[PDB]
Amino acid sequence: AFTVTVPKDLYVVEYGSNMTIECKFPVEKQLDLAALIVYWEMEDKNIIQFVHGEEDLKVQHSSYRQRARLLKDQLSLGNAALQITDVKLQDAGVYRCMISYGGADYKRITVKVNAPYAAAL
Amino acid sequence: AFTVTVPKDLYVVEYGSNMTIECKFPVEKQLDLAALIVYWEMEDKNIIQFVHGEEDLKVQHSSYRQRARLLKDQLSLGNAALQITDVKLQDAGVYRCMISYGGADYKRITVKVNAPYAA
Ligand SMILES: Cc1c(NC(=O)c2ccc(CNCCO)cn2)cccc1-c1cccc(NC(=O)c2ccc(CNCCO)cn2)c1C
């Protein structure tokens, strides 16, 4: 009954740009931070580990340091939004958002990074 | 950090036998059932979805009906044990236990099913 949805499960992004990938969960009235867990990962790499309102940046995988953050202002709209700055080719793959809030659910999201290309016509 | 561990991360099982795969999670004093979620899957197939003490058999994947059980006597010892009855060849693959209990964590278990072979 506790359901996480994704508007899209495939994001095609340009090398070196910014991307935001979103996972929706139901929230009514006061977001209870003490009951909320948000985890983002990409093939076992810890990107975001938001646990009961607190984050520890020492658990964050080194290839995501100063690039990856949770947009905490979106959480009141039931939106766990992961913003990644300066997208790399190694950022392509399968991301998971995993959310515990009342129930639990997770989604898979595929990211494709186009190789850098000077398109001329 | 809430941590789930696995004694074995690979199980080799005989076709048609039973297996039990275990995920350990830390539990102190009274198991707070209102706070606990245990979820087992394999390749997006819902095997066990234990939510605060309640299970919906109607959410279980058709291929696990009457075959898959969570051993609830183990939960008080912090053991999330999935027992699968009458193992098929299509039970081979990657299982996941996901546990929310204070914190949250999940682990992967690989199951390989040996094709039936006569001595
Ligand atoms: C597991 C989990 C996290 N994970 C972390 O916080 C986390 C942090 C760090 C590490 C790595 N550590 C390595 C050291 O061992 C790993 N995990 C965060 C929020 C929630 C969960 C959770 C916990 C328990 C259960 C369910 N699912 C389900 O209950 C579930 C049920 C049904 C479905 C299928 N639904 C499809 C329809 O949308 C999916 N799902 C989830 C999703």
Numbering used by the authors:
A (entry chain A): 18 to 138
B (entry chain B): 18 to 136
From the article:
Programmed cell death-ligand 1 (PD-L1), also known as B7 homolog 1 or CD274 belongs to the B7 family of immunoregulatory ligands, and is widely expressed by lymphoid and nonlymphoid tissues, as well as various tumors. PD-L1 expressed by tumor cells plays a critical role in the induction of inhibitory signals through the interaction with programmed cell death-1 (PD-1) expressed on the cell surface of T cells. This PD-1/PD-L1 interaction results in the suppression of tumor-specific T cell responses functioning as a tumor immune evasion mechanism.
Compound A was co-crystallized with hPD-L1 in a dimeric form and the obtained crystals diffracted to the 2.49 Å resolution. Crystallography studies revealed that compound A can indeed bind PD-L1, but through a hydrophobic pocket, which is created between two PD-L1 molecules thereby stabilizing a PD-L1 homodimer. The LHS amide linker carboxylate makes water-mediated hydrogen bond interactions to Gln66 of chain A and a similar interaction was observed on RHS to chain B. The central benzyls bind between Ala121 side chain of one chain and Met115 side chain of the other chain. These aryls also form van der Waals interactions with Asp122, Tyr123, Ile54, and Ser117. The two linked central benzyls are rotated by −106° with respect to each other at chain A:B interface.
